[PDB]
Amino acid sequence: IPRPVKSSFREGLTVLEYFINTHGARKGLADTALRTADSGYLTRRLVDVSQDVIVREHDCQTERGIVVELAERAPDGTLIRDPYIETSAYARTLGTDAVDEAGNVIVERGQDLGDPEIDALLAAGITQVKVRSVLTCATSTGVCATCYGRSMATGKLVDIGEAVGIVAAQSIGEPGTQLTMRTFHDITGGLPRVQELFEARVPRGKAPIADVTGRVRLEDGERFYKITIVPDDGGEEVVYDKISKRQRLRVFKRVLSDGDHVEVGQQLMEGSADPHEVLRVQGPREVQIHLVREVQEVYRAQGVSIHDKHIEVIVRQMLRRVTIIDSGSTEFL
Amino acid sequence: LISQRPTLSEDVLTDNRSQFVIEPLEPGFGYTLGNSLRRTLLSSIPGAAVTSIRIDGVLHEFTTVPGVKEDVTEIILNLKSLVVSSEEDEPVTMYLRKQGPGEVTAGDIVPPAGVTVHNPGMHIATLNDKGKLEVELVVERGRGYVPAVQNRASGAEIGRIPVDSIYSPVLKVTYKVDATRVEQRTDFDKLILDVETKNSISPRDALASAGKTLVELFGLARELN
Amino acid sequence: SQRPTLSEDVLTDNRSQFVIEPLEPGFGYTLGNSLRRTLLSSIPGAAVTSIRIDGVLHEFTTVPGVKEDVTEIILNLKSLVVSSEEDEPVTMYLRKQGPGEVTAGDIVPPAGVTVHNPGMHIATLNDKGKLEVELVVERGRGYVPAVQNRASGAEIGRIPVDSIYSPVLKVTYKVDATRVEQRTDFDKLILDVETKNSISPRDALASAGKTLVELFGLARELNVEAEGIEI
Amino acid sequence: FIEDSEAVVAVDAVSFTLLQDQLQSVLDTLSEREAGVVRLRFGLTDGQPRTLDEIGQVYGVTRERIRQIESKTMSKLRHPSRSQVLRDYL
Amino acid sequence: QETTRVLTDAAINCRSDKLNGLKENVIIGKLIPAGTGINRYRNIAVQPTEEARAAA
Amino acid sequence: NPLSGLTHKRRLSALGPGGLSRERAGLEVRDVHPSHYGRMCPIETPEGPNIGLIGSLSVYARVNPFGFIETPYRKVVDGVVSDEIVYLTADEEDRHVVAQANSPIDADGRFVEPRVLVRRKAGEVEYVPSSEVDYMDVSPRQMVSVATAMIPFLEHDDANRALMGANMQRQAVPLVRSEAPLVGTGMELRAAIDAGDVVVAEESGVIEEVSADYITVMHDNGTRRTYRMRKFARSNHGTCANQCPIVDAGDRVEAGQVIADGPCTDDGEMALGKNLLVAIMPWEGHNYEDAIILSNRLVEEDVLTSIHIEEHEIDARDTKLGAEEITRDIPNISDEVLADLDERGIVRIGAEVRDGDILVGKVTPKGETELTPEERLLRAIFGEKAREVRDTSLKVPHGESGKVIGIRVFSREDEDELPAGVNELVRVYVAQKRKISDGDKLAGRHGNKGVIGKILPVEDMPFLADGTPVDIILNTHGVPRRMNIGQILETHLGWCAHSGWKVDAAKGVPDWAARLPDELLEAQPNAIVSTPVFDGAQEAELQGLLSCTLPNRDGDVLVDADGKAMLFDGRSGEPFPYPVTVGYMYIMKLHHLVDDKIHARSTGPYSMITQQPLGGKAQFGGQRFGEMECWAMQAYGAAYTLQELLTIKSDDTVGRVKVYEAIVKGENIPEPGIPESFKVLLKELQSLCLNVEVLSS
Amino acid sequence: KLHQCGLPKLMALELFKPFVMKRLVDLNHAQNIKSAKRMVERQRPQVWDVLEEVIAEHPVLLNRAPTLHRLGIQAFEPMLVEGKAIQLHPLVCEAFNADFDGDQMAVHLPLSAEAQAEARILMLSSNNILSPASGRPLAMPRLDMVTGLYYLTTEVPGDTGEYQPASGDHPETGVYSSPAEAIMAADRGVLSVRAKIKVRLTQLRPPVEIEAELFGHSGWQPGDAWMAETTLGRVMFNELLPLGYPFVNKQMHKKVQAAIINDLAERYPMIVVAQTVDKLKDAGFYWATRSGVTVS
Amino acid sequence: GGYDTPLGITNPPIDELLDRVSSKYALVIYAAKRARQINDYYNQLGEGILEYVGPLVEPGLQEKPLSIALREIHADLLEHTEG
RNA sequence: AGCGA
Ligand SMILES: [Mg+2]
Ligand SMILES: [Zn+2]
C-alpha cells in the first residue's frame, strides 16, 4: 500500500492506518492455517515414502561416496570456512583418508568427523573430503550404519535398528508451518517449491539449461529471445526455440554475454529446471547434488538447520527404479 | 563490636493500627526480620470466624428469602466480612432475629458470652414490611484460611449453610529500615514496622502472639544437645 | 498437628547438609532466609584488620627479598582462621630469616589468640631474605570491607585489609513439597552450610538458633500470655 | 457413540473369578461331606443342580437326612466368621 | 490410495504380501520390524551369570 | 455473558444454505475488502477455521431494505460540515469521497487545513483539497464492532492480539460480585442496557416495594407494575443469570433507566471481570511463557468465583416386560445412601451430592434370566430376593458434586406433554460454586490470555512499600513481541484512576493538559474513567496524569512519574534492585475451566461395530493415539509400546480382560492377540469375494 | 526435575486404579477386591498414601497433538501434585511447541515390562536433549532463563566495587580471596554482581591458555589455585557447569549457551548434561527475577 | 566422571548402562526379560521351586521388578546372547 | 450442528 502507515503503536495508530494493517494481519493468519494443513499433508506423504529405510547392517563396506565442499578456497588465499558445514559435513564417516602435499594421513577411513577433526583438517589445509552417505550404501534392503553416520539425537553412532527413514521424514516435514514463501510474486520459492521439488513436477518456471559446452549463439528475436549452443566436437546445434523476454539471463561470478563458454549442463536463464532434464544430462550424481542443494537453499533461507542426511535418505528413495527401453528377451515390458 | 542488646519501643497511631520500632540491629538484617514478622502476622495469628449459618426460611444457599432486598449468597458475602473474637475453643452459636422494615446491622446480633462482635455498624441486609430474617451463626476458633467444610463430610442436616472461613485478625503489615551506616563502621539497622489489625485484637496482642509463635519452630533447631 | 524434625548429612569434616521436615506451607521460606542471615552475620568471630611490613613504604607492588608480591601476601593472610578473646586489637608478629617457605606456624601468638591451621603456606623467601610482618587482629561480627585508615599517617606502614569475621563461609537453601496428599502440601527445608575449621556446622547452627530465639523472645516478651501456634 | 451396555464389564470377570476361589476355600473350611452336599445341591461341580433325591441316592441315604444336613450346613454358613469374607461380594 | 483398483488388480495377480514392512505389522498388530522388534533383539536369551549363580 | 448474548446476534455468517461452505470458502473471500469500512468490523472474527467467514456488524451500520448495509455519514457542502445524516451503501461510498471525523473542524462546519485525508473509490487514500470533500465520517470507532469497541486503547494494540481480545471478551463468565471496570470505553453502559439482560424502567415513576424477587413501580398516573426478577436461572452454557435490584423503596426512576443489574452488570454498565493489582515482572519462572500467578486473596475474598448449574434428566418409560417405576424400593443397596432420597424417589432439595451418588431411585423390569450357581448360593445364604426388576437409577456422573437447586418433575398423571411410551419425566438441577483454581484461563482485554501457573499464599507476594500485596503477576517477555502495549497503557491509566489525580493548575494549565476536558484536572480515588477507542488518552496526557497521583493516606507517592514502584520480595525479603511496573488492570475469567477439561479412563464404555474405547468426556472414552503419534513411536523404535497401545488397550477383545486379570493378580501381561479392526477388515474382504488368507511359509 | 513431571492426584487415582486396588488389598485395608474398588471410588484418605507407593518408579507418556515430530511424546516419572492441572517441566516446551495459553496434553500409561523399559530407556526426557534434525539442544534454556543468564553474566563498566589498580594513597581494593568472600561482599552492599574484580579460584578449571601458562600440561583443579579477572556473576555461572569444563568468561548470548551445551553433550555423559541444564534453568529463573526487565 | 548423584527414575545412569550391551534396544529387551523372570519368580514362590532364580541383588522395601533388573544390569550380574 | 488449542 503506497501510503504508507506512519505511526508507531506507542503513538497510537489512526483509523485508516489501522484499517490498512488489518489486511496483512488477517492474510498472515489465514495463510498460517492453510500452510499448516499443507505441511501436515507433506509429512504424511513423505513418511510412507521413507517407511522402509531402516538400518540393517553395521557396515556395507563400500568405497563410493560423495565429496563435500568443506571451506572452499579464498582468492587471496586462505581457508575461509564454508558457512554451511554443520548441515553438510558433520556426522559423516570418511571412505577415503586425508593426505596433503604427499604428507602423512590426517584422518583415517571411517571416523565420526566431529568438531576436533574438522578443525584438524582446516588446520592442515585441505578443502575437499570424499565421505560416505546413504545415497551410495550398497546394502540391499535399507542403509547400513556407517553410511548413515552419527545419529544426530544420541551423539553416538547410529544403532542397528533405527528407523532413520521416518526420522528423516519427521525432520523434513516438521519445520513447515514457519515457512512463509518468498516475498517476490512469477518467482516461486516456499513450501510449494519444496513440495514440487519432492513431487518432481517439472518446475513451472523452467529455466533452460545447456546440453554441451562451447560458446553461445545469442540473439534477441521478435519480442523474445533466441539462444543456441555451438557444439565443440561438434554436431547438431541445439536451438532453443522460444525464450520469452519475461525472463532474465543468468548472472554468475558477470551477466551472460554472447560468445561466453558454457558448461555441459549450465543453466542458461535464471530460474529452475526439471530434475528430469538435469538427470538425462548429468546423471544420478548431479541430480542428487541438485536436489539436496535446492531444498537446503529454501530451508537455509528460513534459517532452519536440517542435516543433509535426511534429504539424502529421501532422494535415495527417489532414485531407486529404472525404466526399460529394450526388453532384451525377458519379462520386462 | 557493639555489646548493646536490641530493645523494642511502641508508637500508637490509632486504636487499631500502630508502629513498632526495634534498634539497634546488626547491618543487613532489618529487611529479613521485617519480612519474617510480616509472614508471621499475615499468615498465622489465631482468630475466630463464622463457619456456617442456618436461615429458617431457606433450604440451601442459592435461594432467596421473602422480603429481604438481597439474596442468600449476597448475605453470605456480607457476613463473610464480619469480625468476631471468641474466647473458648468449642464452636458456639449466636442468634439473629429481625422483623419488619429497616436495615439489619451487625449490632442486632445477640452473642453469647466470650464471643464479641467488633463492628456493629456493618450493613448485612435490608428488610421491608413483609421482611422477616431469622438466622443462627456458628462461630469457631482457628487459624489461617479454610474453605467450606462439606455437608456430607459432617453429619449436618439439609438446612446447614457452610461458609468459607478466614481466621486472621490482621489487615495490613509493612515496614521500612533506616540504616545509618556511618563510615566509622559502627553500623546498625533500625526496623520500623507497621501493623494494622481489623479491630479484632490489638496490634500489641497480635505481635505478642507472633513473637510467641516464633519460639516454637526455632526451639526445634535449638533443642539438640 | 505435627512436630518437625532436624537431621544432618555430614558430607566433609566441615560441610553439612541439614534437613527440617515437615512445616506448614509456607514456613520453609519464613525461617530459611532468616536462618541464613543469622548464620552469616550473627556468629561472633575474629580476623586480621591491617598489616605493616618492613622494607615496603610506597612500592606496594612487590616486597624486596621475597618471591610473591604484596597483594598475594595480603590475600593469603586474608584467608587465615584465628580465634581470640581479648577484645582490644592485639598485635602479632611473624618474622623469619633465610630462604624457605613461610607457613602459618611461624607466627608466634601472644596470650589468648590462636591459629587453627598452622600448616598453611603463606610466603616464599629467597637468597637470605628476612621477612618480618606485623599483624593486627581483632574480633567482630559478619563481614567488614577494608576499613579506610581513619588516621592519615599515624602508622605509615599500616595498610588496611578486609576482615572475614564470620566463621561460616557459604550457606544456601531450598524448599520441597513432601507429602502433598495426606498432609496437604507441607514444605521441607534443605540447608547446605560450609564453615572453616574453627567450629563445626552443628555448633554454628545451634549458636545461630540461640541468637534467633533470643531475638524473637524480644518480641515474645510483650504479652507473654499470648496464644499462637503450639507443637 | 453407541455404548455397549451389554458387554465385558472388565471388573466383574475377575471379581467372579476371585469369588469362586473364595467359595472353594470356604467349602474346604467345612466338612468334606457337607461341602460335597452343598456343591451338588447348588450345582458348583458341573452346573447341573442336583436335588435331594439324587443326592440322597448318590450318598445312599434319605432326602430328609440330606435336608437336615443342608439346614445345619447353611446355618453354619450364616455364622458371620464363615461369612465376613463373603459379605462384601454383594 | 486408489483402493478399489489396487485391491482388484492385486486379486487378479494373487500378489501375496510378505509383511516385511512396517505399516503392515502395525495394521495386523504384530511386532514391527524396527527397533526392539527385529529378531537380532527380540530373541535375546538372558541368563544370570554362573559365578553369581553359585554365589546365590 | 451478556456481551456474548448481544454479539451472537448482529453476527454475519457467509456459510449457510445458499452459501459458501469452508470447502468453497477459500482465502479469496476471507480478506477485508476496503468496502467493509463502517459496514463490517475488520477485527472480530473467530480464530478457528472460520477467519473472515463469520464477522460482526459495525456499531453504526444499518440494513438497506434490499439487504445491503447502509452506513451513516455527515454531508459537507462547500466546506461547511452540515448535520444532515445521509445513509449510503457501498456504491455511493465509491461514487463520492469520504473524509475523517478526527479532523480540525473549526467550530463552524469549516475545515482548517486544505490538504485533508480522504478515501477514494478503490480504497485509495489521498490528500484532497478541502473543497471536494462531500462526506465525512459520523465519528471514529465507526469501523469497529460492538465487543471490540469496548477494548480501551485499542489503537495501540496489533490487529492479531486485538482480534484475540475481542474473541475472548465474549467468553468471560458471570462472577458473584461483578465489579465494574475502572478504565473503560463508552460502550459499557449502552451495550449493557441494549443487551436485554438488564431490567429497564419502562415508564417513569416512584418505587413502592422492592425485594430480591420483584419490584413494584408506581407510575405517575395511577397504574402500578411489577417487574419480576430472574434469580439463579440456568443459562444455555450452565452459568448463573441472577438479577439483583439497585434501587431503594423511596427512589424515583425515569423511563429507560436501569432498574436491576443482570449477570455481568454493575450499576448499569458491563462488568466482565475484576480490577486487580498487577505487576509485570517475571517471578521465579512460574509466569513463564504466558503463565499467570494470582494471590491467595482472590481465592479467599471470593473475587474470582463462578456459579455453575448442570441439568440431569431421566425418564420412566414403558418397556416390553412391563413399566418402569421411580421409587425407593431399589435392589441391593444399604439404607445409608437412601437417607437423601425423598419418600418417592428423587433427592431432597439442597442435599449435597458427590460423584456416583443416587439422584432418582428408578427401577426397570429384567424378566427371567437363570442365575449363575455362585450368585444362586449367595442368595441362598444371604436370603436376598431375586429382584427381577433390574436397577438403572440416575447416578450423578463421575467428578461432579455440588448442591441441588431445583427439581422439575413432570408426569403422565398430570396430563403433561410427554413422548410416546414415557410415563414420568424428571429433571434435577445441580449447582456448584467453582473457585479460581490453577490451570484455569484468565485474560486481559488485549488478548493477553494465560493459564494460572500457581496461586501463592498472600505473604510470598511482591508487596509495595505500603504493605499492599500485588494480586497478579504477568510476564514481561510476552509484551514486546506481541505488540499489545495497550495492556501497559491500561495498567498505567488504571493506577492513575485508582489513586486519583490533581493537575495543579495554579499558574494557568500545564502544557499537556491544555486540551483535556474540564473536570479532569482532578479526580477522586477509585474514580471511573473512559477512553473511547480511537480518540482517547494521549501518551503526553498519560505522562502528565502519572506525574501527579496524590498520595494514598500518608505522604507516599508509591508510583513515580515513570510509572514504576519499588517492590519488596515477599518471599526472601530484600527489595528488588530495579523499580517494577505496577497498576490496576481489568481482567476476566475465561470459560475454559480445569474441571470441565480434566479427564481420565482406566476402563469404561466401548464402541459397537468396532470394539474400540468410546470417545468424549460426556462418556469416559480414551485419547485418540493418532497416526502422527504412531509415527513418533516408530521413529523412537518402541515396538512393544506400539503393540500394547494398538492391540491390548483398544481392540483385543479377549486380551483386555486377560490383561486386567493379570494386573489384579500381579501376574505378567499376556502377549497381544490380533486387532479387532483387522478381523473386521478380513471379513469384509472375504465378503467381497476376495480370498484373503494367511500363509505360514 | 527434568525427568519428573506433575500429575493431578484425582487423575492418577483413576489411571492406576488396578494397581492401588491390588496394593491396598495386600495391606489388608480391604477384605477383597470389590470392597477395595469401592474404597478407591469413595476416596478414603489412605488411598493416597498407597497411591504414592504405586506411583513411585512408573513412567508415563505425555502426548501433545499435533505431534509434529519425534519429541511430541516423551516419558516422564510422574509425581503427585495438588490441583487439577498437569505440571510440565518448562524445558520441554521447545520440543512440544507448547505455550501455556491453555493447551492440553494427553497422559498415557505403559503396562507391560517391555513397555515400561521402552519408556524408561528410549523415551525418557533426560535421554532426548538434542534435535533429531540438526543435533542442536532443545533442552537449551530459552526465553526468560536466557534473559536471567544474560543479566547474570553481563559486565557493567563503572559499577560498584570494581578492581582499580590505583595506588599511592590506598591499595587496589579489588581482589577477593574466594568466591565465598565475594558472595558475602555482594550480600553486603559493596560488590555488585556485574563488577570486574580479581578473584582467587580453587574449584574451577581455567581456560586453555592460562592452564598452559601456569601448569603447562597437567594442572588439576580440585587443589590448584589461580587468580582471574572476571565478574562475580560469571564465577557463579561457571559453578553450574561440571568440574572438568574449563572456565568460560563471556557474555551468555543464546548462541553462546547453545555452543556450550552442544560441546557438553558431545563430550560428556547424558546424565551430566541433564543435571547441568537443570542447574542452568534454576539459576536463569532466580536471576531473571532480579534483572528488572519491565515494560513501561 | 564426577556427576551428581541421580535420584528416582534415572538411577542407574543410562550411559553407564550402554557400555554393558551393544545398543539401547538390546538394553531394553535385556532388562524387560529379566524383569519378567523376576515377576515369575515372585508369582511361583508359593508352589514348588522351579528353574527361575532371583532377585540377585537385594531389593528395596517396595521396589519394582524392572528397576531391580536394571540395577542388576548395572551391577554386572547377568549375561545375554542376541539373535 | 457449534466450539478450544
Ligand atoms: Mg497456545
Ligand atoms: Zn553403507
TrEMBL record, chain H:
Promotes RNA polymerase assembly. Latches the N- and C-terminal regions of the beta' subunit thereby facilitating its interaction with the beta and alpha subunits. GO terms for biological process: DNA-templated transcription. This is DNA-directed RNA polymerase subunit omega. It comes from Mycobacterium tuberculosis. One of its GO terms (molecular function) is DNA binding. The RNAP catalytic core consists of 2 alpha, 1 beta, 1 beta' and 1 omega subunit. When a sigma factor is associated with the core the holoenzyme is formed, which can initiate transcription. Keywords: DNA-directed RNA polymerase, Nucleotidyltransferase, Transcription, Transferase. Belongs to the RNA polymerase subunit omega family. GO terms for cellular component: DNA-directed RNA polymerase complex. Its EC number is 2.7.7.6. It catalyses: RNA(n) + a ribonucleoside 5'-triphosphate = RNA(n+1) + diphosphate.
